[PDB]
Write a protein that binds this ligand. Structure first.
Ligand SMILES: *[C@@H]1O[C@H](CO)[C@@H](O[C@@H]2O[C@H](CO)[C@@H](O)[C@H](O)[C@H]2NC(C)=O)[C@H](O)[C@H]1NC(C)=O
Ligand SMILES: *[C@@H]1O[C@H](CO)[C@@H](O[C@@H]2O[C@H](CO)[C@@H](O)[C@H](O)[C@H]2NC(C)=O)[C@H](O)[C@H]1NC(C)=O
Ligand SMILES: *[C@@H]1O[C@H](CO)[C@@H](O[C@@H]2O[C@H](CO)[C@@H](O)[C@H](O)[C@H]2NC(C)=O)[C@H](O)[C@H]1NC(C)=O
Ligand SMILES: *[C@@H]1O[C@H](CO)[C@@H](O[C@@H]2O[C@H](CO)[C@@H](O)[C@H](O)[C@H]2NC(C)=O)[C@H](O)[C@H]1NC(C)=O
Lengths: 56, 50, 7
């Protein structure tokens, strides 16, 4: 959708032209490859909406 | 509004229809192609009268 | 989803 941002301790996805923070999920993001390649990357948990309902 | 240049260029890749991970996965190569292409402008403008 | 439905 847009940009990762942090308010100091949390991390959020947001749209570029108006601040509207969202929880980072496997829907609002996409995977590509291993963490070693990217110049500037951070460690935070990405939420996966299927798993906590599926394993309920 | 400030933005890191490596991220500015990611949304310019995203604007031509190339998925933005193509920049971050190739960022060194892309910066070398840019720096080398600016170098050739010195030579064109230094050498050529027309 | 399919193989995860085996959970
Ligand atoms: C960053 O954003 C998070 C989520 O909006 C903030 O965490 C909340 O902080 C308030 C107090 O300001 C608490 O009442 C909530 O319980 C917190 N929520 C969660 C899920 O922990 C956080 O304070 C913000 N600011 C910073 C500096 O991290
Ligand atoms: C922004 O720059 C900092 C450094 O100013 C990056 O953090 C690391 O900094 C040390 C010391 O200068 C370097 O040896 C590391 O190679 C840097 N790591 C990386 C991955 O660059 C910081 O990560 C940079 N962040 C972004 C988003 O570019
Ligand atoms: C981000 O997380 C990764 C993966 O956890 C860290 O890389 C290594 O992680 C393993 C355990 O998963 C550790 O045994 C290694 O010691 C870690 N490597 C190093 C050099 O410490 C990575 O360090 C984390 N980066 C930050 C900035 O927290
Ligand atoms: C994509 O094309 C670039 C050139 O535009 C290739 O990069 C060069 O590759 C050779 C052989 O590995 C190196 O000696 C050069 O130093 C590279 N140039 C630069 C500017 O880094 C690249 O190998 C090609 N990649 C693929 C996957 O085809």
């Amino acid at each position: 959708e847009g940009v990762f941002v942090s308010n100091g301790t949390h991390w959020f996805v947001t749209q570029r032209n108006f601040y509207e923070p969202q929880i980072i999920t496997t829907h609002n993001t996409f995977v590509s490859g291993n963490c070693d390649v990217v110049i500037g990357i951070v460690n935070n948990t990405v939420y996966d909406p299927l798993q906590p309902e599926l394993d309920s | 509004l400030q933005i890191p240049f490596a991220m500015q260029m990611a949304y310019r890749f995203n604007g031509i229809g190339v998925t933005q991970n193509v920049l971050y996965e190739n960022q060194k190569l892309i910066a070398n192609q840019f720096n080398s292409a600016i170098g050739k402008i010195q030579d064109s403008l230094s050498s050529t009268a027309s």
